Each structure stands twice: as structure tokens, then as C-alpha cells.
């Protein structure tokens, strides 16, 4: 079966629509998400037209095999989509109305710079390759683009699901290709990160700073070193939930900076002890007293600077 | 093959039933479960009717290909169900009796607020899309809804398996859809959490409080800091078995609150030491003596408040 | 193709046999195992009978498609078995001899109460649904039930592979079902648990008890707290290799009890120190001296009691 | 299609050959490996013979469906091999030359006793079941057994790939079976284990022994206990990369033995302290001085004994 | 369908091209990557030639089944590629233009010697087996080799995608094989390793060296031992992201060397203490003072030597 012939030298417009049934498994490390949706296709094949008076019926139902159907593929899917045809309905004028239900693992890049306070734009790219007979162009039937209310993406808030109505038409291997951009705007549910990572991380840091109210070198060494190890544990926990970015993430920046605080706390703890042994506890006292104000102020200011830089 | 024609303008009623054979793999993080069950379908196709006298036979067995079968799909499945037709039996009035055995990974949201003392309602949504010829409506044959005695969901107690008999009939992409809700009520086996997480977590906390019967700053620092790290280990262990909730879970709340107890224990340990060095051990004694009663009382009361709030 | 017609009102007896080729992947957490075996089926279809004189041949070989084959399924499999027909041989009297080679992931519940000294009974349930024409009943041909010598289940000893010869005949969705129980008796190879978990766990506990021969509070605090953490590490290691049981396991019981030993060791260490500071080292000495005998005796006795309760 | 008829009462000899294209994923815990290879089969079917003069052609190419092909299966595969027929070429005398490209996950037991200095013999078992018409026997065409130069098994050295030319002929379910043993001899690349596990493990042990040059009980307790915990971490790391063996492995033996060294080091550290407090530092000095020589000598000798026992 | 017949004794040239659509999942441990690309094939089949005047059409479109298509396979794929034919276009001269869209998990060895500053050459090997009728040779149509702009490999920079135009023609199982090498040059994004592993690892090492400004044996033991454990944690973290190499990697070398620094730091800490107790603090002072300069200088120089050796 060959494509529909043109009235004039016009391209064939295949109207599309994606209706999300189930959206799930957003893998941060793999930068993938799984989708379960309806794909609707509609084009005019004049060869399939009929008189509703003569035939008796108002629409004709065909099996995929029977008629010409455009080869619509997804660009950013890992493997070819699992698709099952729901219905093919031809109107008297030859306006075909195809509907299929699919499921696919979509590969869409994620921006972790503001993690865990980040928002993402997931993409679903519909594509059609033009045939030697005639050129095929994609369109968006906005009436058939949407999502079920039930649709939930665990640990994410679904903002919108829209399509960029004008396709990206380009040449590939000397043939015209019509690409469409279906955008799923989501924003992360940062809540859990606060009692699980952020606050525990701040508590161990504040515990380290109690060394500024202690003259006991042995106790200070225990305080700063122990807490530093809990900080390493938290850094490792965080980097396991994330991929390797060629940029600093917000949480990454905070975590990195906190190492410097531990490093300087050890230096202070060392300096204070050296001075004490050197029979200069008056100078050590001045440094320790300063550190009590210096450490939280420089911490608070450094954080303002980063939130500023990052947001 | 087209759908059965209507006597009058009535919709076609497809009677359904799910009988669970094997239920397994309830993933808390992924909010999914795997099912292995029988799906039974029954509808009237007058075109398939016959005389049992003339034909000799009391029922006719058809291969799926031979006759019209309604396109029944599952809403909340990740990929299309693995189904194998067991039997198709036509009675002479044309009452088709379809049976298939399926397996599917069902995506059903979970409520972790009362974890590990939570109970859940797992869902299985049967759906049918109406055709251009006629409208299809789902029904529940209660005689064919159930589960095998053998059926066990590891670490969960299976309460019930029922169907909401009246379908959710709604329009989707200008066509009628009949949705059915099969509900599997389960409740978690919280037992193991007690000797594995809850009690070990309480023992390390109580060990931290022995610092209230010690004047040794160096020992107290070791006691409180060490136990705090074991608490971090337990917090991490717990959050690995769970997804990121935009709400506090019961265990999450207990765990978070316990950080504050470690924080204040460090403050006490610090205050007591500062006072001792400042040659005011009488005041430090008062604080330490108070802490011995204050810490367990405020702990016990805070827990009453949370269990109250959570249950 | 319809089932064989009955001589009288007798049911059709399908003789079965499972011969294990490869048995592997026993998942303790998932309570599953993978099997690779031969399935043999034999029944009498009088319609397929022939005279060996006239035909010349002593048995006829058919392709599955050509003849009626009973729909034998497995109850406790996650997904439908991957089966490839090896041979179908019909004798002159119409005694069909079907053989297929299959592989399946079988879901069989496990009893962890005596872990790692436990023994299990893995099950393989063959089932047949009776047709409207006639009732089908399963039988066991003991001569075709067995396992290859080569068959090895890693970290387990294979005791036996037998079938419960009398089937469980019951009604399901108003039709007769013949269920057969193939039992694979295995017992765990507990050896490795001894040098990897049990003895290391006992060594850290015994190290904690050296605090009973020390007057140094700071050293005792380090001894008991450090070892307690290694005990937490071992508890976590153990519970990662196991599912969440609504009952205590033998190892679970030992592990839990050992927390109480650490708790009381801290109490002793605390009491001894308090008394020393209170200028009462004579009383502290009595307690410490007692603890040296009390701790191992109460440990040894508590263990006798548990092994007694558990075995 | 029936098997080739015999000239006399001889069995049908199917000549075999496996040529490895890609060998990968040797799972130590699962005792499996994945293979991608060519399978070549050759037998004489007199029915397919032809005159090259009359026909014109020197060999005839058939589609698998067209002719009789022996049912060759693999014994030790988890699931049935993914096979794609490359070519079927019939010579004038009726000598069929089948070639297929397959991929399979082969289950072959591993011996960990000498780990990580172990060598293994991976197996690939070809098998054929005799038919009622005639008996089928496997043979090895050595000219068609081999492996590509490119073939690499990560972290392993491939020694050889040979076939045991005489098949294991035996009865199974009253039918003759011809089994062939394809052996892939490999030996582990132990290199990485030295700077990653062995030496780090020895360094922490030697650090523990510095307690023999210290009179500070508190320091010794820290030294021995800390290092013991790093040893526990290394023991856990090792046992995660390995399955549960009913025997001791070389690394397992070394690791276990090192626990005894930590245990006795604690005993020494305890004894030395008790004696010091008891105002007997002369006796404690003797013990400590001895321990300095005793610990490395008994360590070195114990290791000679084990390497001796193990190799 | 047989292959195209030769004009003279020339081989059939199948022109090839791979156009990468989506490149993803580069597994360092498994040494695999997943690809989603277009495969284009073009050869001359004179039997399919036609007059464009008589036929009317300028190119003819065939279904794969209708015509002879060369059996092109991939050498280094784990399983056979998931391929879906996009188009088959025959020109009047019989120049076939095949296009398919595929996805495959490619197995390509990785060189970790310079990790995480390494660059790799991923391979895709196209292969064709010659038939008994005629020999088949692969060619590269450079105009149909490329990659989409969108193509991103997470944590890697894609340098180039080229094909080695002259095929590797060799005999395999007495038949000619034409192998082509498609090379994807990539280089790792080392950025993240710096704030996540390299700098944290250096901070803990520098913290250990503060023991050179302390006379407190108990504090030094805590400092060096604690930091050593954090170093073990980092070593383990690193070796989990990598496979077991029979060679030293750059990061592996740095990590290993740092153990020696901890070992010698313990020795110094021990020596200094022994001397102090021995009432020789003047000699201990000299050693400690030297260590303050020796440790960073020997560290810095050792690192120059390694970067030199490695790059
Ligand atoms: C004679 C003293 C006995 C102490 C027993 C402790 C009982 C703890 C019960 C926990 C039940 C759950 C909260 C934990 C505090 C630990 C006890 C501190 C001991 C102080 C000794 C002072 C010496 C005069
Ligand atoms: C402290 C740690 C204590 C360890 C408990 C010992 C195991 C035990 O007592 O477990 C009992 C097991 C189970 O053997 P069974 O045949 O299944 O018992 C069934 C007997 N009935 C039917 C009478 C109930 O005996 C063994 O495997 C003994 C050898 C293992 C010793 C390892 C100790 C270190
Ligand atoms: Cl697609
Ligand atoms: Cl363009
Ligand atoms: Cl074009
Ligand atoms: Cl479905
Ligand atoms: Cl089954
Ligand atoms: Cl096989
Ligand atoms: Cl391939
Ligand atoms: Na079509
Ligand atoms: Na149908
Ligand atoms: Na059949
Ligand atoms: Na300490
Ligand atoms: Na055949
Ligand atoms: Na073809």
C-alpha cells in the first residue's frame, strides 16, 4: 500500500495527539521516565472516501493491515514503543482516525543545577519520514493532547503537558522529517530532603562547632573528625541518588563548601592546642572566642551568596 | 469482525471477573505490585447463536481469531499484560464465555504516612473503549471475582479483594469509556520493624542519656556523638526502603525528632562542661540532674503527641 | 480440536511427570526459584488409535497443532512458562506421549524461623481445567518424576523431589480443576554463616566484655560503644539477605538479644564510673567482679533457652 | 518431516561445532556467564541428495522449514537460546551444513576455594534426544570449534576452548540422549585484589600491632578496635562479591584468621593494662615485648600453613 | 530468494551507514553502551531494474519479504538488534536503498588507566557472511554516517563518529566475512570527581597531618586512624564505580599510595610517643618537625611522578 496521492503539490498533514494514561519511574541517574499513553493520528486518504447514502454506514472501521498508515516513530525512546491499535475509523470524506495505546521508556535530559529545588521539561518527540511518493508533515490537534487526572509522577509535581504546534522540519539522509515536541513540565517535591539530608547535615555541623566552647584537644578532635565522617556519609548518600554532572548542583555546592568548614575547624582546634602547649592560652582564647562568631556568620553569608548564585 | 448489533439502542454489557492466582513483589519505592490472575469476560453475540438439536453440541469452542472479542485493557499497568487465552465457550443463545490467564505489573499509589503501621488499597482498573458501531459498558459478575487461598504477599496481610460493581462511564477523545475498580485491601506486617529498627534505635538513644550520670566531658562527647552516628545509619537504612514523600511518615517523624534529642544532649554536655571549667559545678549539677528526668519525660510526651497526630 | 470422548462417564486422566534439568536462583527475599525441566504428559485419545499391521508403523509422531493437547498450567509461576515441545508420540491404542522442555520462575513461600539452619519444601503445582465436553484429572507417572544428578542449588542441599500422587480436585468458577503438588525438599548450607556472621559477631561481643577488667571509663565507653556499632553493621548485613517476617528468626533472636547485652554493659560501665567518682570504688569493684561471671553465664543460658525454643 | 532413514541399523551422527563470537558477564554470585557464538550442525540426509550435472548447481540452499533439522538443545542454559539461522547448505551426497548464530546465559558451577587466585572450566553442553524412528548421536568437527581473537572475558584470562570429542550417551525417560562437553578454561586476574583488598587489609592489621609499642590503654583500645572495624568492612566487601560456599575460600580463610589476631591483640592490650594498674608493669613489659615478635611470626607462619593447605 | 548474480566474477558491494539517533547508558563496570540509530544499506540487484518510461514510476518501493536483502549482523552486540524497516527504494538501474531503525546493547572494551581523565573509542562492528552463490563485501557511504545534534552520552563528551572505510575481509568457517569498524570517540567529564572524591580525599589526608603539630598520642591515634577509615570508604566508593582491571588506574594508584602515607603517619605518631615515654622528647621533636615538611613534599613529588607515568 502506497501513501495518499496529492490534490496539488501539497504535503500530507498527519494530525497528532498524545493523551497520558500513566506516567511513572523518573530515573534521575538514567535521565529517563516511563510513559503509558494514547497516540492519536489523523490524515486524509481520498482513496478511502465513500458516499454514506450508497454504503449505508457513517464511518468504516479498518484493520491496520488493510490501509496505508504513516510510519510515526519516537526520537528519544530507548527501544521501539510497545503499541496496540485501539481503533481506525474512516469518515465519508476519507478522514482517517487512528488511535493506539502505547508504553515507552523516554530518554530526556535533566538539569540538576538547582537540585533538589529543580523543575524539568520532559520531552516526547514524534517524528515522520517523508516517502519518495510524497512529503509528510506533522500537526497537533490540541483537542486530543492531554493527560488523565489520576496521572502521578512519584516525588514530582506535574505542571503541564503541551505540544509545540509548529513542527521542526529538517532534512536527514536526503529526506524531509517532521519532528514534534510534546513537553511535560514537572517540578520536584523537595520536602523530604529537608528532614532527611539538609537538617541532619546542619545538626552534625553545629555539633562540630561546640569545639569552640571546649579547651579539651582530645574532645575537639573527636567532635570535628566524627561529624566530618557523618558529613562524608551524607555526601556519598546524595551522589548515589544523582548522575555525574559537568557542573555544580545546589546541594553539591553546599556539601562541598561544608568540607572547608570542617577543614578550618580542625585548623582552629590544632592552633588552639599548639598555643595552649606553648603556654600562650590567652592568644588561643582570642582565636576560639572569635571562631564562635566567625564560623556561623561566614557560614550564613556563604550560603546567601550560593542561593543567590544558584537562584 | 465487527461488534454484536443491538436489539434496541442499548449498550453492549461485558461482564467481568478477576480471580487472583499469584500476587507478589510489592515494591514500596516504585509503588508497584505484580499479579498473576484469571480474567473472565462474558457478553452476548446473537450472530454466534445456534440450535443444539440440529448441531448436536450444547456449547461451541472458538479460537480468539474466529470471533469478535471486546478490547479490554488495564489502565494502571506499566506494559501491556502478558495474556494467554484459556477458553472461549459459546452457548446456543450466543452467550460468549471468555477466560484468559494474565500476569501484569500494576502501578498503584501507596500512602506511607502511618509506615510501618500502614494499610493500603491496591487497584486494578479494567477499561473498554466504545466503538463507532455501538457503546460498550463493563459489569461485574461477583461469582467470578476472588482469590486463591495460597495467595500470599510477602510482609503484608491480604484483607480483601472486591470490585466496585458500578463502572466509571466517561468520555475520552470523543468516545465512551467504561472503567471498573478492582480493590485489593492489604495491611503491613510491622512486626520485624520493632526488633530491627525501632528497639535498636531506642537503645542507642538511651545509651546517649547515660551522659547525664557522667561528669567526664570526653566520655559524654564519645557517648552522644557515636550514638548520633548509629542514628544517622538507621535514618539512611529506613529512607532506602521508602520513596520520597511530600509528607512526613510516622517513622520519619520519630527519626527526625530523635535528632533534636541528640542536639540538645550535646548542648547539655557542652553547658555542663563549660560550667565545670568556669568553677560552677553546682549549677552544672542542677542542669544534669534535671536532664535525667527532663529527657525521658519530654521524649515520652513528644511520642504520645506524634502517635496521637498520626493515628 | 475437541477433547477425547469418554467410553462411559469417566474423566480423562492426564498422567504427568517433571524431570529437573537445571535448578537455580533461590531468592530468599523474593521467595522464588528458577527451574529448567522436562514436562511429560500422557493420555488416551481413542480417535488417534490405529492398526500397526495396516499402517506399518509402530507409533505415529504428530506436531502439537495436529492433535488435541490438554491445557496444563502451573499455579505458582510468576509469568507463563517458556516451553518448547520435544516430542509427541501416539501408540496403536491411542496412548499419546507428549514431552516438552520448560523453564519457569516459581514462587514458593519460605520459612525463615530456623535461619540459617532452616530446611524448605519448594512446590511446583500442575493444574488442568476441565472442559464443558468432559472432566480432566491429573495423575503422577512416578517413572517420569526425577532430577538430573548434575542439578545443584547454590548454598542449598537438595534432599528429594517427589510428587503427591493424589491430586487436589476442587471447583473453581463452576468448573473442576485437578491440582498436583511437586515437592522439592532442600536444606540450607549453614557453614559460611559461622566464619562470616556468627563468630565475628561473638568476637566483638567478647571484646565488649573486656570493660569488666578495666577501671578506665573512657576506655570502657570506647569498647562497648564501638563493638555495638559493629553489631549494628552485622544486624543490617543479616536483614539485607532476608525478607520481613511477621515472626522472629533464629539469627534475628540471637542478634536482638545481643543488643540487651550491650545495653546492660553500658549500664554497668556507667554504674562503676558513678560509684568511683562518688568515692565508693569498693561497691563498683563488687559489681564489676560479678559482671565478669554474670555476663557470659546469662549469655550462655539465654542461648540454650533460644536454641531450645527454636529447635 | 521425519528423520533421515538408516542405511543399516546405524544411528544418525550430527557433527557439531561452537565458534565463540562474544563471551561476557561472568557472574561469580550467580555462577553464570553469557555467550554469543556460532553453532554449526552437519548430518547426512540421503533424501536431499542430487546429481550436480542434472540440477546444474553444486549445493542447494534450504529454509529451515523445508527440511528435517535435529532438535539440538543446551543442557546448562537458564532459558532456551536466542538463535537465528545463518545458512543451510546441502551438498550432492545429501550432507547438510547448518549454521546459526546464538546467544545464551549459561549456568556453570564455579570453585571458589582458591579465590582470587582460582581457575575455572566453564561448560556448554550440547544435547540431542533420539526419536522413535532412529537414534541420534553427537560428534565434534574440530575444524568448526574455536573462538574469535577479540573475545575477552572482563577480569579473566581465557586459556582454551575445546570439546570432549566422545559424547556422553545415556537413557533419559526411556530414550537415548547424546550429550557433548564444550569446555572454556579461564583463570582469574587476581592483580586488582592486591592493592584493593589484600594490602589495605594488611596495613590496618600492622597499624593494630603499634599497640605493642604503647603503654596507653586508651590509645591501644582505639588502635585495635578501630582497625578491627575496618577489617569487618573488608570482610563484608569480600563476601558481597561472592556466593555462599559450603567450604572455606582462600581469602575467606585469611580474613577469618585475622579476626583471631584482633581478638588476641585485645586480650594482650587488656592484660598489659590490668598488670599496670595492679602495679606489676615489669610483667606487662615482658608480655608486650614478646607480642612484638610473636604477633608477626605467628601471622607469617599461619599464612605459610594456609597457602600450603590451599595450593 | 537468491543473491544478485554477478556481471563478471566480482563480489557484491553492500554500501553501509549508521546515523546515531540516541546514544545512552555507558556502563563502566559492564563495558557496554546502548545505541538507537538508523542503519542504511545499498546494493545493486540487476533483477529489480526497470524502464522509468514503461513503468511510469521513478522508483519502486518493496516490502522486505518481496526481495533479496543481505544478512547484515553486528559482531559486538549482546543480543540480536531490535530492528524495524523504515524503507526499501529501488531505482531504475536496480540500486536498492534499504533503511531500518535499530536499537542494540553494544559490548565495547574500555581503558581505565587514565580514569577519571580517560577517553574511549566505542566500536560498532558491521559484518556480512558471503553466500555459496557469491561473495559479499561491505563499503562505507560517508554521506550516510553521522549522528543527531541532540545525541548526548551522560557524563561523557562525544568527540566523533566515523567509520574505517576499508573493511576487514577474512575467512571464517571456510567462508568470506566483510567486517566494518564504526568508531564513536568519547572523553569523560572528570569535573564531578574533583569536589566528590579527589578534594574530600585530600582534605582527610591533610587533617591526618595535623598530628605533626600535636604531642598528644591519644589525639594523633584518633586523627590518623579516623581519617584512614574515611580513606577506606573513598577507596570502596571508587572501586564500586569500576570493573576489576589487571592494571593500575590513575585514581587507583593515587588511592593506593595514600595508604602508605597513613601507614608512615602511624609509624611517626608511634615513634614520637615511644621516645616521649623513653624521656627523649628532643629526638621525637626532631622527627615530628621533619615530618611536617617531609610528608607534603614526598606527597607532592610522588604525585608528579605518577601523573608523569600515567600521562
Ligand atoms: C542501681 C542503679 C541501676 C540502674 C539501672 C538502669 C535502668 C534503665 C532502665 C531502662 C528501661 C528501658 C535512660 C537511660 C539511663 C541509663 C541508666 C543510668 C545509670 C546510672 C547509675 C548511677 C549509680 C548510682
Ligand atoms: C551463639 C551461636 C549459637 C549457634 C547455634 C547452633 C545451631 C543450632 O543449634 O541449630 C540446630 C541445627 C539444626 O539442625 P537440624 O537437623 O535441622 O535440627 C533439627 C532437630 N529437631 C528435629 C530435633 C528439632 O543444628 C546444626 O546445624 C548444628 C551445627 C551448627 C553449629 C554452629 C554453632 C556455631
Ligand atoms: Cl518509536
Ligand atoms: Cl535541513
Ligand atoms: Cl524530501
Ligand atoms: Cl492491559
Ligand atoms: Cl504456566
Ligand atoms: Cl537450548
Ligand atoms: Cl546483530
Ligand atoms: Na498499513
Ligand atoms: Na477477535
Ligand atoms: Na493442540
Ligand atoms: Na576515642
Ligand atoms: Na525442520
Ligand atoms: Na527479504
Author numbering:
A (entry chain A), B (entry chain B), C (entry chain C), D (entry chain D), E (entry chain E): 5 to 315
From the paper:
At present, the best structurally characterized pLGIC is the G. violaceus ligand-gated ion channel (GLIC), of prokaryotic origin. Each subunit consists of an extracellular domain (ECD), predominantly in a β-sandwich fold, and a transmembrane domain (TMD) composed of four helices, labeled M1–M4. However, the GLIC is a pH-gated channel, activated by lowering the pH, with a maximal activation at pH 4 and a pH50 around 5. We instead found that proton activation is a complex multiple loci mechanism, with the key contribution stemming from the coupling interface between the extracellular and transmembrane domain, with E35 acting as a key proton-sensing residue.
In contrast to the nonsignificant individual mutations, E26, which is found interacting with the bottom of the β4-β5 loop of the principal (+) face, shows a robust decrease of the pH50 when mutated to both Q and A. A combination of E26Q with mutations of vestibular-facing residues that tend to decrease the pH50 produces an obvious decrease in pH50. A structural analysis was performed on E26Q, E26A, E35Q, E35A, E67A, E75A, E82Q, E82A, D86A, D88N, D88A, H127N, E181A, and H277Q mutants, by solving their structure at pH 4. The key mutants at E26, D86, and D88 were solved at pH 4, each showing a structure similar to that of the Wt. All structures were in the apparently open conformation. E26 clearly is an important residue in GLIC function, but other techniques are required to elucidate its mechanistic role. The report identified E26 and E177 to have loss-of-function effects when mutated. E26 indeed results in a loss-of-function effect, whereas E177 seems to have no effect.
